[PDB]
Each structure stands twice: as structure tokens, then as C-alpha cells.
Design a protein around this ligand. Structure first.
Ligand SMILES: Nc1ncnc2c1ncn2[C@@H]1O[C@H](COS(=O)(=O)NC(=O)[C@@H](N)Cc2ccccc2)[C@@H](O)[C@H]1O
Ligand SMILES: [Cl-]
Ligand SMILES: [Cl-]
Ligand SMILES: [Mg+2]
Ligand SMILES: [Mg+2]
Ligand SMILES: [Mg+2]
Ligand SMILES: [Mg+2]
Ligand SMILES: [Mg+2]
Ligand SMILES: [Mg+2]
Ligand SMILES: [Mg+2]
Lengths: 834, 245, 336, 49
RNA sequence: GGCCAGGUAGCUCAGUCGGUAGAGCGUCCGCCUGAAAAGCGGAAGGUCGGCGGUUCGAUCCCGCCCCUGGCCACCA
């Protein structure tokens, strides 16, 4: 089970004690409940049924034999001494049982018309119904059996089952444990409708039973967090007694299966009042009851029969013989009530909320009791819930309530359970709301929710009730006023914001890079931080490559992928094969996202108290403990870079496309870069450039190594680029160009160099020699014909000269060209082509 | 003259990022600024300074990615709300910021959930801020992303780091199963414990905050019933949106 | 709290960004037309571009006409740059023009001791000439420079059509191009640009006589669109990514040489229906197998279902429906 | 790997326009908005009013 | 964390309880076309999720584990 379920009729009945005649539509109730802060998950009407659906009594059972299943032909008394034969395949009933039959002419939900049918060689005048088939509850895998005396045969089924009802499923927030009960939800509705509320846990509704002496003996170990622990016996109950239909019906509608009166009553009163209750067979108890911590390795067997591995933070209830319960989580089988139990010891205890939560979550037992205790339970009502349970059980099952009572209230005894008072200015909710509430609203709302309120000038002294431990500061009181008045009254006013500075330079640069890559034909992906399994082995990185130093997730999505990415390429490359695998063979992807690069101090910082600002040193320590998380930009390409069309067959991706991607990013960042040959997996060592901004390395680009492509299932020819954006300085150039009105001179120069000399190094050498007259140099020819020796290449550059103050002669330009050729000779060994 | 002429077809930024850009511009035009925070975060800022009790069940390993070793108190952040803390620690008052970035949870995938997603955080802290200012900001946010014909609703809720707390739903016409109110994000007045954990006096300053799903915003805005294509990175999802927006 | 940039304001930035990224350099164009430009263009005497607002006291006595088109100023700037050594040039501008009408005249003084009434406000605005935002571009010389990769590509009319598509993508609208005659463009290399069925401008290679008479470089191409006639748009796409595999087929159709390739592709889309995921022209053939004044076009087709794997016969049925649609709308004959 | 790679060199928006865009961003970030007016104008608005 | 069904080719799936395992689409080739696709003909491609074990031999049997989809559960 999971959320707070309850039927409207019970809710209405508790509301109507103080507000006689109160009744709303389920539509209206759902709206009211949402408005004051209770999420309605489901509104589930019961039924509906039409036509002859009535109570019957099973008067005889004939077993039909020789079928794939046991089958019963049943004589059913349907009233007025009229008997019908009905074929039924269930087994969970005997002669004399009250059942619900749908005779022919009946309509069951949803839309099932019942007609007389031939079943297993016999005629059946209808069917015996299960609870699911009546839309009354989930199934017990058999048909529904009303307890003896629920109704006479022939009674109207819909009336008897109460099928007009509607069940609300609410998802109560964790700060409202008091709403895990009819008591708290009824209180809330009385607040919303300004009704008078009669508390079902008050002494006028549950008058105290006698206290003439102590019940069972009890010890409670210090520092177990138990706040209250009360015990009262009911002696001499009839074990053949079953709970009346009205009680079984309400348990069922609340999602709880009825079993026996002793257990049924504790579940009922838990639902009604919000205090979990537990029934012990007092005659299976041996000696003093004690609550203590489990020991290491201690197991206990819960009443469902599973062996629970216990831990030392877990609170037990034990006797001399065995463990009786995991405190506020689940009872043990040793004192469970049985079909022979006659003398019952009822336990109303208040456990530590955090302890119950820790324990129930480890053991995965989110029982009805445990999820109330972990949201806190009103300790003021323990004996009232005990007395309610005892009286009800003695009435249902023929007991006598014993006038003894053990009521441990801590050491020393606590007798006033109210939270401490809260001082708040009377107009504080108005200011937080932005609304001028009518005078007295705050005092009136706070009194409705149960607080005691006194006035001193503009100051209220507000003492919350014991079922509202969440009410600790003025803001908690504000929330109470605002939600009950309704958020709809709060107006909509944009704040004047001061003048901001807009996007930072880095945020602006990210937009520009992404727009430029997109325009150039790259599609963005949002890469997963979780590296592929063994990716760096697939890449073939040495054992001490910095990329291997990764931060590790303890509990990853895929156990094989615990490592956080030091590089975006593994996720981009994975996205590339996904797209290629689905028919998009020409692909160009990019990502701009942080990576995660731990270091030495990348470890833990203990809890800093949150009642104060961390000091500046504590702030800087926290930040130094985290891994470095620089922003990176990366791209991958495969297939055709340019598509085919009427103009021709299109161009395959090549390394220079990855180099051009670097230049698109650099132009977008307004920095200049240089590319230098480098060896760096996973790139092809002869088609890899390291990228520099000034003399600082910022990344790498080129074609991937053939073996990486091979081992990773990548398309042949795949290229890639990855840059560290945080290493690219934030430039802001302020050019002031002066345009020369004089004509330029054009000359070309062909230079022969060793084959391994980069062309850019020749252009740099030419520019260093040519001087200020050189306006532009552009390579337009790389030639390696037979005129050129082996391992040498001829380069021809177009040169453009221009002076700021004069027309040049050819001889002016030739002298600059000559000094450029000399500079190329001295720096890269160039020979003027001859 | 109608022959194809695009020798290098356009690509596309991801629509989540284009939506983030548009949300940012909306708030910058109101004078707010865009704050940032790391994806690997301390527990101190993701849980403790945001007023989560020590045993809060969102802290368990079933709910939150933790960084090795066992108790580094490091994690993948589970909401953008730690940026409230970093901002109030780093900036002087008053503060008017949003933050947009990735958040991480150990969630099952369904039509409106994925383990790695994005949120838009908002935080305003100043003298005299009220719930009316929260509502004004949320209405401007919704009106800019969904238009004026957008049905929203605000109802009281709970977060450990706000009091009062509220949730905002959007009427989602294309919701798988039939149109219904779907939650858009959470909001409230900043809890006084959160101000005290950052050295701000709750008697002088009040604040509001909110946190909306970014993919969730895109689902409402473009009527995409199932978010998983949005997450998986197939080029076919992104190209229809265009190189820019 | 302000609302930031308007849609029109954002779109102007995006167009600017995109054209500059594509190699175009912005000029801020003078509004004073060159002396007798429309005579050098050879425009008809009733061409609407000749209905210009005139400045009483201009900078140059021979240039009193205010521009109804940005091309004269861009083309003058082109000649200026080419004359100073930069022969490979691409320029754009985004600027208002001035287009008077009948009601373009004076409005008498209105007393400034009160607010002008709403009728006077509207009469003042109606008395001014129309001043829509235009975007325009010109190119000459090499579109793509030479380098190690070979000798580079001269500007051609298709570069002007691509500039239109750069602008349309930036504006997030679809355009269609249709053959047109419209000076100063070459009547055989001129497109009129359409958004929906609204004309927004023209693009292509300039007429050789206009080039000769204006001293422009051989092959100069040009674009001019009316931005204010391009509607704003806010597309809200919701793609669904089919996990199933696709089918690839090609189709060769023969049409009369005057049928635009895009009208064939549209007919193929029309006939093929929902399975068609993509269509791309990749061959235009007019060799000796093809009759005179006809052409063979071949398109790559990609079919894909949202809920199943297709058979080759499923795509073939869709292809055959496309073939029939093409015969019915453009007279296409399946290549044989 | 140092060979020239840019097959279509970048262009440029005019610096006056880029400066206007940056000035507009500055004021939008303060909550202000960008208003427009035509280049051919009435004497009523250029002078009299 | 619970329950159910699964993991087999580049994609979507059928199937097999010891020695051969497949279809639709995707890839490649021949005829064909100027070049294509279709059509006709012919190929390639799987460590049947992983690691141990049993066995002369394992997709299939035994053990441990991992992941995927759905329905629940939990929650900032
Ligand atoms: N797994 C998920 N996948 C996609 N989107 C998600 C996922 N989980 C949450 N969201 C979206 O994120 C929104 C907020 O998430 S939340 O868990 O409900 N609440 C928070 O995270 C709070 N930090 C929001 C908040 C509340 C109050 C003040 C500031 C901020 C949701 O309303 C969804 O729109
Ligand atoms: Cl040589
Ligand atoms: Cl022909
Ligand atoms: Mg509260
Ligand atoms: Mg010479
Ligand atoms: Mg979760
Ligand atoms: Mg699962
Ligand atoms: Mg919630
Ligand atoms: Mg085929
Ligand atoms: Mg598969």
C-alpha cells in the first residue's frame, strides 16, 4: 500500500458530527482539497450496479467433478424463500455463508449484463460476485463473503455494500502526518468550510476507561527515542468472532484486508485517529516487555513469516523469550494474535520518526504503521486510541476491558505535549501574501488549525497543537493562513528588478559557438556524462593518460558505466554510431558541455552546521574538494561532408573538415589559433593537430586512428575535434583599421622545402621577412612532380603588397619578396624554385 | 532557378538549448541575470543548506547518484536549487537570478521523466518581496513560453527549502491518455533556515524561488507527449527545429 | 520588466549574423540614388521603382532621388571595392527604402499645446512615404577562393539563390523560387521569391547590358527581398523518430526542359504520401538519349513507416503513385 | 595539418551595427526596450512637437 | 527496491531445451542505365547479453552477473 485512501462517507460522517447535514459533491471536495494543499490522486466511485444484485445465503454446495478445475453448483437463498442454482468456481465459502449474487437482468460494472448461461453442463441463474467484479475492492482471489448477520437474504446488494460511496486517494505531503487519518482530513475540511469540528479523539467522543492499576510490566532503554508507550488488556474475547460488515467494509475501502477482530480494530482505529495500534496475544508474552536496540546479526521473524536481517539502529520490542516487534514497523509472529487467542494486550506507542524511517526503508517494509510514524504521530492521543481500541474490541468480540493501564510517558513523565510557543506579528501573513486580509483572519485561521493564540499589541503568541510538530517558525504559521484563505487571492505583481548586466562574456560566447557550428551543418547533442565501458582501452591509451583519472559514481545507471567523462568524444562517438545505425549515414554532431576531471584534493568535506554562513575558508575548501569541471566543445563527422546534388557527387569527410571546425570555433570566440602536428590518441598520428591559442594548448583535431574506428565500430574516415573552452581566453579586440587609398602590387613566390615542413611555417617565415608592405599571403599550390626531389615539395604563395602613403614600384615589392625568401631560407631551409 | 543550391545543409542546435536561450532572454529583459553551478556538487549545497533533514529519503542511493568513495559527500546534483546557495554566498543583495542546467536522478524512464534532465531555477531575494511577486514572475515566465492562452494553476505544496510552498500545473492537451493538469515546477518563499545558512537576516530580507523542468516546458510548448526522443540524440528530432530559433 | 527585442528586431540580427557567416560584408547604403541609375538599368518608364521621393537640397545636385531599392547603392559600393584591389566581393545591406504613394504630401502645422488627435496621428503617418525594411546582397568574382584544394569557384546565379535560402532559414520561413523577367536581372537567370503566394523579391545574375553600362564586373549576381513582406513565424515542431529501418529507391523522370525541378519533386511528394521521408535531386541529364527540349531528372527517395518495417514492394507502390502524380502534374514520363 | 582549411571565408557585420547591437543589449538587460522610427519624417515630430 | 516479459544481424523481430539460426529492410557484386533505382541473379555480415562450469563439443544444460521494455513502489 502507498497513499492515503478513504471513503467519502466516513470522512463526511466525522465532519458531520460537528456540522450536521454537511454534504458536498465529490467534484467540489476534490477542488477544496487541492486548494488547501492535498493532492488528490484518484477519485474512485463504487459500483455502479443496476437490476437484481442482492444478498444470498449459500444453502447447499454440489461439487462438479471431472473438469480442469473444481466447480461448485450452489443452491442460493435469494429471499422470500426463493432459491436459485448458481454455478461458481471459487472455493472461499461454505454452506451458510452470506454472498452477493447478480441474478439475470443485472448489470455489473462496467457494462456486463448478466444473463442465464449454461456452465459445465448445468444451467446457472446468474453468478456469485467477487469484490472486484462489484467494483468494491481488489480481489481476495475468491468471491465476497459478508460476515454473518450483515444482512438477510434478498437484501438490496447496492444498499448493503454501500455502492453509492466514492473513494479518495490522496498523496499527503510529508509535513502533514496528521492528515494520514480521517481525524486530520476531517479537521482540514472543517477549516476550509468554516465548520465546527468535534475531534474524534477527544474525551467527549472517547471517554476514558478506568485506570485502577498497571497493566503488563515494561522497561524502556534510554535513548531509543520512544516518547510514549501505553498498554491495556482486553480479556476473554471470542476467537470465533468476526468483525461486523461496516468495519470490514471501511478497512477494505481504505486498502486494508480484514482478518480477525483484534487486528481489524487496531487498523480501524489507526485509520480513524492516526495512531497505529498493535494487538498482542498476552498469553504468548513471557515476562517483562522491553524496548531496546537490536544487536549486530540479530534476525527477527515478522508476522508475515520472513526472516528480517536487523541492524543496530533498529528498535525492538522483546520479552524474555523472543522479539515481539520491530518497533513501529512490523509485529513478530511470536505474539501475533491467532485463531485461538483469548486475552489481548493492546499497545499504543510513539516511536522516533527518524528511527522508523531509517529502519523501514532499509528493510523495505513501508507498513501502514511505519509511514505514519516516520511523519510523526500525535503523542497526546495514545491512551484515547488505546481506549477506543479496547472498548471496540470488547464490543465486537465479547471481551471485557480490564481496568488496568501501563502508560509510560518518558523519564521523567511528560504530561503536556504542545510544541513551544511562536511569537509572530499579527500582520506578518499579510506582508508575505501581498494581501490585506480582513482584520482577525490570522488569529481565526490559527485557532481553526488548533493553535492557542494570545494577543499582545501587534504580536501574537501562538502555541501549536501536539499533532502539528511541523509548526516551528513564523513562516510555518504564514503557510497555514495563506493556504486556507486560498492562493487565488494573492495578486500578480512583477518585482522591479534592479538594472542587470545581462549575459556574461562566457555565456555569450557559448551562444555564438553553437549558432556557428549549427550554421556550418553540425547537429547538437546533449552528451551523457557516463563513459562507455572500457572506452579508453578501445582507444588504446597508455595506463597513465590523464583522461583515465576519472571520477566514479557509486550507483550508476549501468553498472558497467560508473565513470564520469573526462572527454566529450566518447559520448559524441556513441551518438554518431546510433545515427549511422538508423540510416543517417552522413552525420556531423557537436556538443558544448562540462567534463569532470578530478585531482588530489578531490575528496570529502564533513557537514558544516547550517545555522550559520559557512566561512569564506569553508566555502573555498568545499569548492577545492570538487573535481575540476571545465566547459568543453567537441564535434564528430563521418560520411559525406557535402551531399550530392545536381552539381556533382558530394565530398567525403576528411581531416581538414575537422581543422575547419576548429577555425569556426576560433572565429566564433574571436581568437586566433595555430595548428601543429601532434600524436595523441585517439587521432591518426599523421592526421592530428594540436590546437594552440598563443603558446597554450587548448585541444586537438583531425581524423581518428584506424584501429580506434575499427575497435569502436565507427564509420571509416571518422574525424573529430575537442577543445577546452575554459582554456580559450575571453578576448575583446578593439581594431582601428586605416584603409590605404593606394593600389597594391601582386607577386607570387614558389619555394621548395623538405616535405615535413608545415606550409604555415613557410608563410610565417615569408611574412617575417617581407615586412610592413605585405598585406596578404595565400597558398594556392602544393606541387610534388618530378622536377621536385623526393621528400621535398614546392609551395607557391600569392603575395599582395600595399603601402599606406604611396604607390609602389615592382622593384619595391621585389625587394620585400627577396627579404622574405631570405627569411624562408634561414627559418625553414626554403630554396627559391628554379 | 529552382535547382537545389545548398551545398552544405544547415544543422541545428538542440531545442532544449534553444528553449533555454529563450527563457534566459525573457528574464534578462526583466533585469535578472543568469547564474551557474557545477554538475558534480557537494551534499552541503544540494541537501544540507537547503534544509533537508539528515535522513530525508531523497538522500538515499535509490534516489541520488553518489560519487565514490562511500561517503565523499559528493554527488550528481539532483536539482538546480544548490545554485540558490552558491548565489547567496557569492553575490551581494539584492539578488535576482535564474539558472538553467542539467540535473541527475536515478529515475525510471517514462513519457515525462528521464534520469538526466534540465531545470530552470529562479531566485529573488530583496527587502519586501512577497508571494505576489512570485506570482508575477511565474505569470511572466508562463506567458512568454506558452502565450496568454496558457492555462496554469498554483496550489499549496511542500519543499524543505520553501515555506510557504506551492506547485504550478500546466493544462497539457496532448498528455498521453487525455488532456490533464501536469505539474510544471515547484516554488515558494525561501525558508528562513536557507537564509540563515547563507548569512542573510530573515527579518530584513525575504525571497522567492522556483524550479521548472526544461524538457517539461518544451513538452507543453510544442505539444510533445513523450520526452524520450528529446533525450536520445537522433538527428531526426533536432533538424525540424532549425539551425536557430 | 521589459519584453526585450521584438521578433522583427531579433530576426534582423539573425539575418545579419547568417549572411556574414556565409562570407557577406555589410555596407550601410546611402539613400541617394546614383544619377540616372534606372536609365542605365533600362527600366520601363512606368516601373514603380522610378516613383521616388525627391530631396530639395541634396548633397549632390544630380542625386536628389531617394532610393526605392537598395541595389543601386550596393552596386556602387561593389564597384568601389573592386576598383581598389578586392575583385572577389560579396556585400549585403539591411536597410529601409522610400516608396511614396498618392497620399505622400504635406500635413499642415498642428498646435503643440495639446496632444494630436488619433485622426491627426494617423493622417501624419499616412502622409509619409512607405518605408519598409529591405535586405539585399551583391556578389562578383570568385565565390570561393583558390587554395591548395584547386582553383576556386566563380560566382554564379545559384549563389544568389543560396543567399535567398540563407535569409529564409534565418527568418524561419519557406520560400519558393519561380522563373521571372525583371530588370536589372538577366531574364534567363532570374528568380522571383515567394513566401506562400506573396512575392517578396528577386535574385539571380544581372543582365549583361546593365553590367556593361554600369561598369560592373562580368557575372555580377544580386538579391533583394522586402523583409516587411516576410511574415513573422513561430514554428512549434513535434517530431516522432521512427525506430524502424527505411527503404531507399531512386526514380528517373523525363520532363520538358522548362519544367522546374522543384515542381517535379513536389509532384513526387504529392503522389507518394506519408511513407516518403526525404527526396533529393542528384542528376539532371540532357545527353543524346533525351529528346530535344527535354531533360531527365533522377531523385533519391527515402521511405520509412512509423510503425513497421516496409518491403521493397511497399516502397515501389508509393514510388509508382509518385510517378503517376508527376505525369498528371508536370507531364513526366518514367525514364526508359 | 597546417594547410589552409577555410573554403568560404567569413564576412562581417558593420562595426557600427555591432556596436548598436551591444548598446541595445546593455539597455534591454536593464529592462528598457528598443523603439523605432522612420528615416523620412514629418516636421511635426522632427521640430514642432 | 517488487512483479511480468525479454536480450538473437546495421535497424525491427521470428525461432531453437547439444554438432545448419533465419525473415523484412540496411550493405556489397554481376546483368542493366550516360549514371541510377526497380527487376532478375549472387554474396558478405551474428563472439544468439557477459563470465565461469558441465561436455569431445553449448545460443540451447548448471551457476553468478549485467542490461532492455512494461506495470508498480519511492521522491527535492
Ligand atoms: N526525472 C525527470 N525528468 C524530467 N523532468 C523532471 C524530472 N523530475 C522533475 N522534473 C521536472 O522538474 C520540476 C521540478 O522538480 S521537483 O522535483 O518537483 N522539485 C524540485 O526539483 C525543486 N527543487 C523545485 C523548487 C521548488 C521550490 C523552490 C525552488 C525550486 C518538475 O515539476 C518537472 O517539471
Ligand atoms: Cl628539389
Ligand atoms: Cl525524351
Ligand atoms: Mg508548512
Ligand atoms: Mg607585374
Ligand atoms: Mg526518483
Ligand atoms: Mg526496470
Ligand atoms: Mg512534491
Ligand atoms: Mg534495394
Ligand atoms: Mg537488436
Amino acid at each position: 500500500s502507498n497513499a492515503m485512501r478513504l471513503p467519502y462517507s466516513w470522512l463526511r460522517e466525522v465532519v458531520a458530527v460537528g456540522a450536521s447535514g454537511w454534504d458536498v459533491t465529490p467534484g467540489e471536495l476534490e477542488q477544496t482539497l487541492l486548494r488547501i494543499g492535498h493532492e488528490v490522486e484518484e477519485v474512485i466511485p463504487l459500483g455502479p450496479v443496476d437490476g437484481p444484485v442482492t444478498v444470498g445465503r449459500v444453502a447447499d454446495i454440489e461439487e462438479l467433478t471431472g473438469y480442469k478445475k473444481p466447480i461448485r453448483a450452489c443452491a442460493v437463498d435469494i429471499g422470500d424463500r426463493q432459491y436459485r442454482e448458481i454455478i461458481c468456481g471459487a472455493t472461499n465459502f461454505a454452506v451458510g455463508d452470506l454472498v452477493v449474487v447478480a441474478l439475470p437482468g443485472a448489470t455489473l460494472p462496467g457494462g456486463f449484463t448478466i444473463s442465464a448461461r449454461k456452465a459445465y453442463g448445468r444451467n446457472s441463474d446468474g453468478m456469485i460476485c467477487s469484490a472486484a467484479e462489484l467494483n468494491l475492492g481488489a480481489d481476495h482471489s475468491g468471491i465476497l463473503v459478508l460476515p454473518p448477520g450483515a444482512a438477510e437474504p434478498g437484501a438490496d446488494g447496492a444498499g448493503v455494500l454501500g455502492l453509492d460511496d466514492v473513494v479518495f486517494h490522496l498523496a499527503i505531503t510529508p509535513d502533514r502526518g496528521y492528515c494520514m487519518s480521517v481525524r486530520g482530513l476531517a479537521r482540514e475540511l472543517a477549516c476550509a468550510y468554516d465548520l465546527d469540528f468535534v475531534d474524534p479523539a477527544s474525551n467527549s467522543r472517547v471517554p476514558p476507561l478506568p485506570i485502577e492499576g498497571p497493566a503488563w510490566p515494561l522497561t524502556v532503554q534510554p535513548e531509543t527515542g520512544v516518547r510514549r508507550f501505553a498498554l491495556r488488556p482486553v480479556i476473554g474475547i471470542d476467537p470465533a468472532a468476526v468483525s461486523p460488515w461496516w468495519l470490514q467494509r471501511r478497512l477494505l475501502l481504505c486498502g486494508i484486508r480484514a482478518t480477525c477482530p483484534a487486528v481489524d480494530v487496531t487498523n480501524y482505529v489507526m485509520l480513524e485517529l492516526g495512531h497505529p495500534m498493535h494487538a498482542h496475544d498476552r498469553n504468548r508474552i513471557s515476562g517483562t516487555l522491553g524496548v531496546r536496540f537490536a544487536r549486530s546479526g540479530e534476525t527477527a521473524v515478522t508476522l508475515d513469516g520472513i526472516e528480517r536481517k536487523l541492524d543496530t539502529a533498529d528498535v525492538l520490542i522483546v520479552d524474555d523469550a523472543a522479539t515481539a516487534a520491530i518497533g513501529g514497523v512490523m509485529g513478530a509472529a511470536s505474539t501475533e494474535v491467532r485463531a485461538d487467542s483469548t486475552d489481548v494486550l493492546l499497545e499504543a506507542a510513539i516511536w522516533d520518526p527518524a528511527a522508523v524511517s531509517r529502519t523501514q526503508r532499509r528493510l523495505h517494509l513501508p507498513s501502514e504503521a511505519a509511514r505514519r510514524y516516520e511523519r510523526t504521530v500525535d503523542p497526546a492521543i495514545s491512551v484515547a486510541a488505546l481506549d477506543r481500541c479496547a472498548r471496540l474490541l470488547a464490543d465486537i468480540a465479547g471481551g471485557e476491558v480490564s481496568p488496568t493501564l501501563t502508560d509510560w510517558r518518558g523519564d521523567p513523565p511528560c504530561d503536556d505535549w504542545s510544541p513551544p510557543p511562536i511569537r509572530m506579528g499579527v500582520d506578518v501573513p499579510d506582508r508575505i501574501a501581498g494581501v490585506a486580509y480582513p482584520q482577525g483572519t490570522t488569529a481565526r485561521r490559527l485557532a481553526q488549525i488548533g493553535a492557542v493564540v494570545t494577543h499582545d499589541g501587534d504580536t501574537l503568541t501562538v502555541t501549536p497543537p501536539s499533532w502539528r510538530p511541523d509548526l516551528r517558525q513564523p513562516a510555518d504559521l504564514v503557510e497555514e493562513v495563506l493556504r486556507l484563505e486560498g492562493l487565488e487571492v494573492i495578486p500578480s505583481v512583477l518585482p522591479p528588478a534592479p538594472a542587470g548586466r545581462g549575459l556574461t562574456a562566457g555565456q555569450q560566447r557559448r551562444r555564438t559557438i553553437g549558432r556557428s557550428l549549427a550554421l556550418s551543418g553540425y547537429v547538437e547533442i546533449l552528451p551523457t556524462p557516463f563513459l562507455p565501458a572500457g572506452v579508453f582501452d578501445l582507444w588504446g591509451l597508455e595506463a597513465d593518460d590523464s583522461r583515465r583519472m576519472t571520477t566514479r559514481v557509486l550507483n550508476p545507471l549501468e553498472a558497467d558505466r560508473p565513470q564520469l567523462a573526462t572527454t566529450l568524444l566518447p559520448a559524441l562517438l556513441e551518438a554518431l554510431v546510433r545515427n549511422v545505425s538508423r540510416g543517417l549515414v552522413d552525420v556531423a554532431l557537436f556538443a558544448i558541455a562540462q567534463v569532470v576531471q578530478p585531482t588530489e584534493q578531490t575528496r570529502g568535506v564533513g557537514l558544516i552546521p547550517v545555522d550559520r554562513r559557512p566561512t569564506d575558508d569553508e566555502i573555498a575548501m568545499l569548492d577545492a574538494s570538487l573535481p575540476r569541471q571545465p566547459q568543453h566543445v567537441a564535434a564528430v563527422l563521418a560520411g559525406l561532408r557535402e551531399p550530392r546534388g545536381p552539381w556533382g557527387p558530394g565530398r567525403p569527410v576528411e581531416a581538414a573538415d575537422a581543422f575547419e571546425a576548429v577555425r569556426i570555433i576560433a572565429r566564433a570566440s574571436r581568437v586566433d589559433v595555430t595548428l601543429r602536428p601532434a600524436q595523441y590518441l585517439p587521432w591518426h598520428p599523421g592526421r592530428c593537430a594540436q590546437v594552440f591559442v598563443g603558446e597554450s594548448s587548448v585541444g586537438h583535431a583531425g581524423q581518428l586512428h584506424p584501429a580506434v574506428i575499427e575497435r569502436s565500430g565507427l564509420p571509416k574516415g571518422t574525424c573529430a575535434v575537442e577543445l577546452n573552452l575554459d582554456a580559450i581566453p575571453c578576448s575583446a579586440p578593439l581594431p582601428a583599421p586605416r584603409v590605404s587609398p593606394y593600389p597594391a602590387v601582386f607577386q607570387d613566390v614558389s619555394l621548395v622545402v623538405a616535405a615535413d615542413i608545415p606550409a604555415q611555417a613557410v608563410a610565417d617565415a615569408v611574412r617575417a621577412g617581407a615586412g610592413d608592405l605585405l598585406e596578404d599571403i595565400a597558398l594556392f599550390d602544393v606541387f610534388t612532380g618530378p622536377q621536385i626531389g623526393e621528400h621535398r615539395k614546392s609551395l607557391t604563395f600569392a603575395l599582395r603588397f600595399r603601402a599606406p602613403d604611396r604607390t609602389l614600384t615592382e622593384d619595391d615589392a621585389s625587394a620585400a619578396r627577396d627579404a622574405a625568401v631570405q627569411s624562408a631560407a634561414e627559418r625553414v631551409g626554403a630554396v627559391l624554385r628554379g | 532557378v529552382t535547382l537545389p543550391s545548398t551545398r552544405v545543409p544547415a544543422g541545428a542546435r538542440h531545442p532544449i538549448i534553444m528553449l533555454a536561450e529563450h527563457v534566459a532572454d525573457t528574464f534578462i529583459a526583466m533585469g535578472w541575470e543568469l547564474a551557474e553551478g557545477p554538475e558534480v556538487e557537494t551534499e552541503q549545497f544540494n541537501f544540507d543548506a537547503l534544509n533537508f533533514p539528515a535522513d530525508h529519503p531523497a538522500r538515499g542511493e535509490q534516489d541520488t547518484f553518489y560519487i565514490a568513495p562511500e561517503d565523499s559527500r559528493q554527488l550528481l546534483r539532483t536539482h538546480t536549487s544548490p545554485v540558490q546557495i552558491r548565489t547567496l554566498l557569492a553575490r551581494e543583495l539584492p539578488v535576482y537570478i535564474i539558472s538553467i542546467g542539467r540535473t541527475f536522478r536515478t529515475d525510471e524512464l517514462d513519457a515525462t521523466h528521464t534520469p538526466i534532465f534540465h531545470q530552470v531555477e529562479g531566485l529573488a531575494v530583496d527587502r519586501g518581496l512577497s508571494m505576489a511577486h512570485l506570482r508575477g514572475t511565474l505569470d511572466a515566465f508562463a506567458r512568454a513560453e506558452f502565450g496568454p492562452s496558457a492555462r496554469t494553476r498554483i496550489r499549496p505544496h511542500f519543499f524543505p527549502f520553501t515555506e510557504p510552498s506551492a506547485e504550478v500545473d500546466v493544462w497539457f492537451a496532448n498528455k498521453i491518455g487525455g488532456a490533464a493538469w501536469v505539474e510544471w515546477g515547484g516554488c515558494g518563499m525561501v525558508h528562513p533556515n536557507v537564509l540563515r545558512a547563507t548569512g542573510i537576516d530573515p527579518d530584513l530580507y525575504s525571497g522567492f524561488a522556483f524550479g521548472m523542468g526544461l524538457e517539461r516546458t518544451l513538452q507543453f510548448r510544442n505539444g510533445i507527449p513523450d520526452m524520450r526522443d528529446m533525450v536520445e540524440g537522433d538527428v531526426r528530432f533536432s533538424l525540424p527545429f532549425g539551425v536557430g530559433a
